[PDB]
Amino acid sequence: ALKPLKTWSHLAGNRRRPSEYEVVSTNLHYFTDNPERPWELDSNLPMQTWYKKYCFDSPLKHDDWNAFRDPDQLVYRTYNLLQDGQESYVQGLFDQLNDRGHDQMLTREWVETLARFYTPARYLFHALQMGSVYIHQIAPASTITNCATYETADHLRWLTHTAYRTRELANCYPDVGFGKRERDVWENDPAWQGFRELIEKALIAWDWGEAFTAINLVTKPAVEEALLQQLGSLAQSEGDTLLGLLAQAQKRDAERHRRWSSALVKMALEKEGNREVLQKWVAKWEPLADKAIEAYCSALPDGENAIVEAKSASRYVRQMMGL
Amino acid sequence: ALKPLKTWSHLAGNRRRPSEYEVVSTNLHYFTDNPERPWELDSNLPMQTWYKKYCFDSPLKHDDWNAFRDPDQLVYRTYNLLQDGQESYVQGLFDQLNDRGHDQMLTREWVETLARFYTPARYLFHALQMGSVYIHQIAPASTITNCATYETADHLRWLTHTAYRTRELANCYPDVGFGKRERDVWENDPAWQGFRELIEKALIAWDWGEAFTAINLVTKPAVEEALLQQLGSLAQSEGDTLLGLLAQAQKRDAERHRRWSSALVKMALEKEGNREVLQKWVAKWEPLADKAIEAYCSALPDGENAIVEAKSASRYVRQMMGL
Amino acid sequence: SMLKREDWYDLTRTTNWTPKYVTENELFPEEMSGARGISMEAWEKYDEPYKITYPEYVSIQREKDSGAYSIKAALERDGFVDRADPGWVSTMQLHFGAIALEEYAASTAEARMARFAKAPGNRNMATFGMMDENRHGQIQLYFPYANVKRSRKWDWAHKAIHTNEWAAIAARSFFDDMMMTRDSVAVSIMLTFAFETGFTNMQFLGLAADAAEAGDHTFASLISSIQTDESRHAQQGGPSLKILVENGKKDEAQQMVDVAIWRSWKLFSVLTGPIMDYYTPLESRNQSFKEFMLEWIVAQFERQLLDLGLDKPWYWDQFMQDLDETHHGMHLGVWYWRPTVWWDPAAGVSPEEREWLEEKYPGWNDTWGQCWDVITDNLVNGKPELTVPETLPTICNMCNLPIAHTPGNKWNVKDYQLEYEGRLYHFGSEADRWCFQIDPERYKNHTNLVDRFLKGEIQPADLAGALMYMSLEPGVMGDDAHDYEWVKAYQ
Amino acid sequence: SMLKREDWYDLTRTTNWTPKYVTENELFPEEMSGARGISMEAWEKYDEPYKITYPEYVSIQREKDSGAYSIKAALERDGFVDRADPGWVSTMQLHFGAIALEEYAASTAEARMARFAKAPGNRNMATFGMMDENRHGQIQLYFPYANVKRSRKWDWAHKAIHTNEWAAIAARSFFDDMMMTRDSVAVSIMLTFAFETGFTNMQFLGLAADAAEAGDHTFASLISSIQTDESRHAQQGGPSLKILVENGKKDEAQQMVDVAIWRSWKLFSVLTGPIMDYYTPLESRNQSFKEFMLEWIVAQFERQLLDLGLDKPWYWDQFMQDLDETHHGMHLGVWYWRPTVWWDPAAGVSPEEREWLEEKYPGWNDTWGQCWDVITDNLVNGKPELTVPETLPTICNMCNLPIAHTPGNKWNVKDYQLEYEGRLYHFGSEADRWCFQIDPERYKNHTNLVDRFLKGEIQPADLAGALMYMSLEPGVMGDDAHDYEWVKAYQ
Amino acid sequence: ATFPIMSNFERDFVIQLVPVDTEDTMDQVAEKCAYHSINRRVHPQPEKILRVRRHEDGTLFPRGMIVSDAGLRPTETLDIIFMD
Amino acid sequence: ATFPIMSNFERDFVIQLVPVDTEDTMDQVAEKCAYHSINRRVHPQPEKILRVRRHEDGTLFPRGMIVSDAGLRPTETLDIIFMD
Ligand SMILES: [Fe+3]
Ligand SMILES: [Fe+3]
Ligand SMILES: [Fe+3]
Ligand SMILES: [Fe+3]
Ligand SMILES: [O-]
Ligand SMILES: [O-]
């Protein structure tokens, strides 16, 4: 007879008592159990082929992805605690800054800057949502997938803040077209085509490894420095404390995504040849990221400086990741 | 045999199912059970005399104080929910505004304004704490006492915010004496003697009715308009967004105290002769309140305007209370 | 001041745009999206009936876990799991092993809609969906985890789906077909509408009720909570079917629903049916598995299908007669083959239980009782070895479950065989064989346990071999839940 | 970034200032403050060992209620209170009625220190204290509230303290003397140090342990939680005693502690003693009430008193012999006078229980057993009317509790009478009479139930009269917890 | 008239309020006390006689002697002992 | 050699895998099937004889006839009925 264990059998002989995180997040995917036939059906189904090509056949290789650990060790239970805290904060700003008529004291020029540079971000934020939710359903291991899960929720969070604020701005300035014209700005404004080209193309990079890179290593730092960092500093200097603070709040999430992205790369570089794989995808996408920062920040005041600070900062992300 | 009831026997025949609030807050004091001997001991003990003189013998009269209801219907459980929400908000501002060096961008003049007009408030805030905790232990009914309970905690909350911020300001500007010289400012600065005289005297008004009036109807509106309202608007216009927001946050608590204070008065005016009782105490204390607003706000920039706006606002409080 | 949800909600789901740097089909490949020629603009009519925003979510779900987790920490040292009826303990072990990781997998099924659904509203609701299943998967690992020192069997709450044990294969067979290998629009219907709205939302309600009656308030609390999340994402199938019918796709819709419902029924006939009619104590049985299906599942399906414009599946009549048999055989099989499962099957055939069975299912003793008579005699006569198998049962090639039906004085066991491309397949029902025929390409080269056996993939090719094959070893290999205690009433 | 608590804490308690517009004595009247000539600057040395700030508080206490309240809502429909042993149900009814409103009252005792303590640190900690008792008072109303439809007795969780029932008077007698009518510094010592640190902090721990063993996880959860709040405010007495000893007040301190401990002991001897040695089932008794006091209360008092520089009370030896008797008599009284209380007293004198009693208390049957023999015979011989009283017992004028002690073959019942100003007082112990003598002005004109009776304040002056007087009526009037079930073992 | 006294019956565990008459005999007092103790929670003793003694100083009162002559403070505590 | 077939024994509730020999007689096939059903969860019937018929079309095979001559598809399902 088998003796009952003091932990999950796959964690046994771990030397240290497994955390709640290890207990509820590890070795969960089962499709990786049979590379030749990942799902319990015909091996020729189009979805069998999809996972085989884009998951198992990725150039980014490792012998035990399930070994990956989220540096923050997030779990559903702790994600809601942390975020419900953060939301109390942002929702608090919303409620009280509204109370002292913060939106009524913004200047006309700045209101137009928001209609062009702020509100249409709801499209780019949802796009990142779609992008990070794809990494989730194609990643090779459950701990990697989970990071993508919570990051997708943060993405929906940013989208949400933006949706809310757009309604408030439309109520305060019904003549600007708030809520109504963001789609045309997103689709036709030259300041958005840099970013729109980037994500639309990155959204069809089906390889799990390239997806991680295209969205997390290249696109996100670009969007975060452009829309959160640069527009955030401008908002503050322009009298918009709400957006200056809101932007900063969302950057807390972004920093978290960079932490696990960076950890995954750390692990990836143990395997010989991966750095080159990662640098090749970065080199393929980085050019589009520059074109995104340029088009967006060039249209902002002190654009040339914003474009330089952003390019520099986003690259710094990958630099210290050892790339 | 007595048939079991569908609620507390003292709530029976209420026409409507009793709320959690009515169930855990009503008819709790038992010292009111025997006016001739409130405590289960000798009737001549100094504390027997204290309650008889300052509680039962109050000029402010009513036949059933236990009938009083807190308009907000606060209970320990719901007080912690509400406040833990508010704290997440204020603690959020503290954390993040620190992150972008908010204290380093304040001007030298404004820093000195804070050392004189802001930080020493820790003394006035604790003083109000002591003042509201006295109303709690002398009020005639448990529902009135409870309001005083939660209000005392809000008072300790304000004291706390101030203690925290004083440490941060001392770290950022160690040469100002932050944390070290507030006692001397409180005791010797002419801008504080108006308020210091008011509370020291109000702190020894042992009659429960006069205490309610002296602290809740007169002193608090004065302090709130002076330190929260006026200094808060000044802070904002001076570049201090943190204090501008913090002040506003605490005002949410203040508004709550005014709501139950106002409700108690509403109930008091049912009894003939109480309006006159209340107006006589107000008339006794109001003069000291003006002297407080004057000394404090006169020293602030645009002081004359601040003194007028505050006097007007605080009086408006009692005006609509029907006084 | 804050805004009312109704004022800004639409803006959270106003996220569709016209791709320019890539084509719509590249952005939304049909194999993953399943737009079925319905335009982006038409999918935009999608409108979930139960709305919720991010801040509401994190706040609500934060308190749910606070409660569930507190309950557990409070009854932890009480070790109820030790005084619990063996029929119950087996129930949980079975539940956790067959569902824990499948719940987590559902997270990915949600993620499929979240990324490939052309309906914006569908995309966000699916993001909360993937968050809902993340919890269900994690919480249902943390809970049984508390008992790993009590039996190696609890370790199966995590290991089951990673093994080749027949019930595990049966599980993955269902789930993979319904939510892991279907396009987005397909997933909303087969999983969300048919399985969650049609079965689990109410099952978990009954499961929670049973947990309580057994004195297991930790599990009762677990299921209730999880249950309260179901409606939030199980609602996603409704609007999809509306869109498909509203256009020229009523037959395609109908066919997915037909497939999904039957495949669900089968899994339900082996995981729930046996449990409420045999594992639960006689004095805790509110109604039979059949009454449960007629009252909480069947009626609702017809209503859902009526208000939606669809019809009742072609097999509806058969499905209802089946409520008198299927689960009884599925139970006899599991018990008769106990060493092949990771929990201890409760025979549930005591004299009293047998008369209850006769009341709920007139003619039971005439048929099913027959087999149990022979089994009981052998246990009384000291011939237990005749109550455990020497061979493998015939597995249905669709539901990967034993092919069984009415025995005794009304013998009616049938095999719906089919020859496709030189291979002979076996089906436990007309419907099962039909699910294969409408889309043969999807199951063609798959092989059930018996097929693998017959192909030398299991070595040694004996019973001990097939046991190491499905990762079973003494310690987790199932036996009679009450240690044949019920046999004394016949001696 | 946030600061560490250690960096700004001191600033929250740097609140003393020198009054100018009123004198220090007007601001802090001695009768309410009790500075005892110790300067403001000297009281500023006060330093609570367990620190906490407002934000930490609301966050921590928010989750505690979330848990306690969730537990309750989860086991609510399970109606455990109905299957619970009567000895247990009585335990809770007794607990809620004698403590609920006294807990709420403690809120005011805290408020006294919060406003009149010259020690700044003491003032803030007391503000959380008043918040802690607000909860204890409210939560212990909400919980028993769930059972008001089960018996009118539960209504006493709120009504008890508002009545003149002897146990209620006994309660108010203690509490009013310890926390409602004493100066701030006095309250920190008598209540916080002697009663909460010395008795309840560990009592509630044992109470929570017993609740669990009985299967009452709702109450077990209630008490555990409440218990976790105790240390936060029970710590306030420590620093006060340090300051008093550090100056010229070691005797004053000693005397408060002596009074407070004994008065606590007495209340404990009637509310806890009877419960763990008679109301709790034999198979759930970990240790006797005596072993409990020697292990969890007495040892700690000596330690506390040693490290503090104080001595053991003059009555310490007597107090320990008393652990063999006091609660036994206090139990016989409550049971023998059941109609005078709002809960049903469990006799707890079955043959088995009696031998357990003999093991824990050698000589029990020789003495206490004696009385119970006569009582048992009458119940067996159909003479129950001889097991209920016709008169009132002699009440101690200090602890307002019956004057009882060793009976049987070692009869040793004594009355420590005293004549003060033409009146004759009765005391159940040397200590009780001493508490009166050191401060006669404090109890002089108070009257216990028997005194009121003898003065015509109770009309009619018969037993039925005294019942309406203490607000008792059929329905709440106590009787044998098990309906004399235990009598069958003697027939 | 009635006079109150506290009865500390021998072998019982508690003092009880017991009204007597100023005219009662120490013998009659003891009988009124026995009522609330004997057969209630104290066994009878025929071979013995019930005597009365002031609890405070142990003074023994002759079986005769009426309350009125004992010089007792109302509510005074008295021992009721078994002897000859 | 061995040949696989699925046994649908009469009065039993399930089809079972039962290996036979290409040389077995329909009589010998039935015996190998009975092994897994008779006395396990189906009562014996001496007055009766076990026959074999292809499940799909109901074709009845002579008691003789060796598997090899029945023209069965491997894994074919066969009824094992009680008759004369
Ligand atoms: Fe789920
Ligand atoms: Fe679900
Ligand atoms: Fe308490
Ligand atoms: Fe306490
Ligand atoms: O779900
Ligand atoms: O407490």
CA–centroid distance, residue D230 to ligand 4 (Å): 5
C1-491 CATH: 1.10.620.20
User: Considering only CA atoms, which residue is closest to atom 1 of ligand 5?
Assistant: C230
Residue C230 Cβ inside 6 Å of ligand 5? The answer reads yes
Any residues with CB less than 8 A from the CB of C470 and at least 6 apart, and which? C163, C164, C165, C166, C168, C340, C449
Q: Rounded distance, CA D265 to CA D200, Å? A: 11
Q: Give the separation between CA C221 and CA D159, rounded to whole angstroms.
A: 34
C72: which 2 tokens?
């557990």
Gyration radius of chain D's alpha carbons:
23
**For this experimental structure, what is the resolution in angstroms?**
2.3
Chain breaks in chain C (C to N over 2.5 A) after: none
Distance from the Cα of B238 to chain D's closest Cα (Å) equals: 23
Q: Is D136 annotated as a binding residue?
A: yes
Positive or negative: CA dihedral B112, B116, B117, B119:
positive
CA distances from A60 to A212, A266, A270, C245, D409 (A): 10, 13, 11, 44, 91
User: Which residues have CB under 8 Å from D101's CB, separation 6+?
Assistant: B28, B30, D137, D158, D160, D161, D162
DSSP string, F4-34: EEEEEETT-SBEEEEEEETT-BHHHHHHHHH
Nearest beta carbon to residue C17 from set A39, A94, A123: A123
What is the whole-number distance in angstroms between the Cα of residue A149 and the centre of ligand 5? 16
Strand partners, E16: D393, E7
Q: Report whether D103 belongs to an annotated binding site.
A: yes
- DSSP, collapsed to helix, strand or coil, labels residue D377 as helix
In 3D space, the residue among B83, B76, B80 whose CA is nearest the CA of residue B28 turns out to be B76
- Write out the residues surrounding ion ligand 2, Cβ under 5 A: C 196
- Decide whether any atom of ligand 5 lies within 6 Å of the C229 Cβ: yes
Distance CA B243, CA B231 (A): 9
Domain ranges across chain E: 1-84
Residue C66's closest CA among D230, D73, A70? Answer: D73
Q: Where are the beta strands (DSSP E) in D309-447?
A: 418-420, 423-425
Q: How far apart are CA F25 and CA F16, in angstroms?
A: 19
Nearest CA in chain D to B184: D17
The count of other CB atoms within 10 Å of the CB of residue C421 is 7
How many Å apart are CA D325 and CA C375, to the nearest integer? 64
| Residue listed under structure tokens 């994402």 | C233
* Among B310, B256, B311, CA closest to B73: B256
Question: What's the rounded Cα separation, in Å, for the pair C369 and C408?
Answer: 8
| Pure H helices in D214-288 | 217-234, 237-246, 250-271, 273-274
A42 neighbors C446 (Cβ within 8 angstroms): yes
Radius of gyration of chain A (CA): 22
CA C475 to chain centre: 25
Which run of H or E residues covers position D183? none
Determination approach? X-ray
Min Cα–Cα distance to chain B from A75, Å = 21
D36 vs C275: CA distance, rounded Å: 74
Backbone angles phi, psi at D315, to 5 degrees: -90, 5
Taking the C-alpha atoms of residue C23 and residue C30, their distance in angstroms, rounded to an integer, is 12
How do the domains of chain A map onto residue ranges? Answer: 1-323
Which residue is it, tokens 């119970």? D372
User: Cα-flanking dihedrals φ and ψ of residue C426, to 5°?
Assistant: -120, 135
Q: Please name which of C177, C74, C45 lies closest in space to residue C442, comparing C-alpha atoms.
A: C177
What strands, in cross-sheet order, belong to the sheet with F49-54?
A: F15-21, F2-9, F76-83, F49-54, F60-61
Compute, in angstroms, the gap from residue D140 CA to the centroid of ligand 6.
12
Token digits for D467? 């019942």
CB-CB under 8 Å, B89 with A89: yes
The CATH architecture annotation of domain E1-84 reads Roll (3.10)
Which parts of chain B fold into alpha helices (H)?
Answer: 20-25, 46-51, 76-99, 108-117, 121-136, 142-172, 182-188, 190-202, 208-211, 220-223, 231-237, 241-268, 274-298, 303-319
Q: How far is CA D91 from CA C216, D86, D97, D472, E1, in A?
A: 25, 8, 10, 18, 44
Contact C405, C325 (CB under 8 A): yes
Cβ separation of B5 and D475 shorter than 8 Å? no
Alpha-carbon gap: A243 to the closest alpha carbon of chain B (Å): 13
Extract long-range pairs of C23-30: CB within 8 Å, 24+ residues apart: C26/A204, C27/A200, C27/A203, C27/A204, C28/C116, C28/C118, C29/C116, C30/C183
Strands D418-420 vs C423-425: parallel, antiparallel or unpaired: unpaired
Residues whose CB is less than 8 angstroms from the CB of residue D450 and which lie 6 or more positions away in sequence, other chains included: D392, D393, D394, D395, E17
* Residue (of C31, C179, C103) closest to A53 by Cα position: C31
CA-closest residue to ligand 6 atom 1: D230
Instruction: Determine the angle formed by the axes of helices C326-336 and C250-271, rounding to 10 degrees.
Output: 50
**What tokens were used for B215?**
């602290």
Q: Which of D386, D373, D388 is nearest to D487 (CA)?
A: D373
The partner residue sitting opposite D124, judged by closest CB among B2, B123, B156, is B156
Report d(CA C133, CA C277) in Å as an integer. Answer: 29
Domain covering B1-323 in this structure, CATH number? 1.10.620.20
Ligand nearest to the backbone CA of C104: 1
Question: In this structure, what token pair is assigned to residue B157?
Answer: 């909350």
Q: Does residue B157 sit in helix, strand or coil?
A: helix
